[PDB]
């Protein structure tokens, strides 16, 4: 049993590579998709009242 590895810098660079890939994949592939779903639902839920009142005012059918 050894505490230290063969190279501390190699393991540190492995951690940096893995975490930087998780950062790029999060910011680039995951967070656009997440925010497309979330901001569609949130924009509709935040604008339902104003949207329906504006469309009710525009609608000449009544």
């Amino acid at each position: 049993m050894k505490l230290l590895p063969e190279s501390l810098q190699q393991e540190a660079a492995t951690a940096a590579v893995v975490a930087s890939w998780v950062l790029w994949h999060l910011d680039t592939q995951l967070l656009p998709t997440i925010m497309r779903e979330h901001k569609l639902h949130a924009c509709w839920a935040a604008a339902a009242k104003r949207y329906n009142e504006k469309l009710f005012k525009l609608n000449p059918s009544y």
Binding site: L3, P5, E11, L23, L26, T33, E37
Partner: protein, 217 residues
């Protein structure tokens, strides 16, 4: 150059949405004194520009650390986190990220014997953040290896199918230990990211460039 199609409402999308909203909620934005409207909206957008992305960073660290921590519990696999350089490199990385943010706020200027004592107390966060997670992963694997040898010894020196109650008891103890290792894997990933959020939120504070001139009524 063509991206893949995603089903809306997938379980990984929902899980990562909850995780991101959690680590984003750890450092909430401050309410301004003025009411938020179109006069205050560039001040709010610049406040969001000056705030560091601790939600993205904490989600990054949570996902990579829980992935390595759970890799330690798959068969034929050890955690990368149980290595010293990996886990303590992540810890020194979070401490240096918080320090680089706090230095850049102070104009890239480095910071009455209270100042070296607080310097050592702050600098020990670099040791503690990585050594905690690395020590927990190393201790759990080491404890399992020592415990497994004792359990193996019981049926090696008492017959394969000749000592049922003591072997059953020690395998119950080993199985409860592996369940504890699952709990410790999840907990140490969450602990690393919570302490990451508090260490960077010490320096996340910035000036709100609000309105300098207004119509009073």
């Amino acid at each position: 150059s063509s991206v893949r199609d995603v089903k809306t409402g997938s379980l990984p999308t929902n899980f990562l949405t909850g995780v991101y909203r959690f680590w984003r909620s750890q450092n909430p934005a401050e309410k301004p004194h003025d009411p938020v409207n179109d006069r205050l909206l560039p001040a709010v957008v610049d406040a969001s520009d000056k705030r560091a992305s601790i939600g993205t960073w904490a989600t990054t660290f949570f996902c990579t650390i829980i992935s390595c921590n759970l890799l330690g519990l798959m068969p034929f696999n050890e955690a990368p986190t149980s290595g010293l350089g990996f886990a303590t490199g992540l810890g020194v990385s979070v401490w240096a990220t918080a320090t680089i943010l706090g230095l850049s706020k102070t104009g890239f200027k480095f910071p009455f014997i209270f100042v070296p004592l607080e310097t050592i107390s702050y600098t020990f966060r670099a040791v503690s953040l990585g050594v905690r997670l690395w020590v927990n992963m190393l201790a759990g694997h080491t404890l399992l290896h020592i415990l497994t040898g004792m359990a193996l010894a019981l049926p090696f020196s008492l017959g394969f199918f000749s000592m049922v109650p003591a072997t059953f008891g020690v395998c119950c103890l080993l199985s409860a230990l592996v369940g504890l290792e699952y709990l410790v894997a999840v907990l140490q990933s969450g602990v690393f990211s919570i302490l990451s959020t508090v260490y960077v939120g010490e320096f996340n504070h910035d000036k709100f460039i609000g309105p300098a001139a207004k119509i009073v009524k």
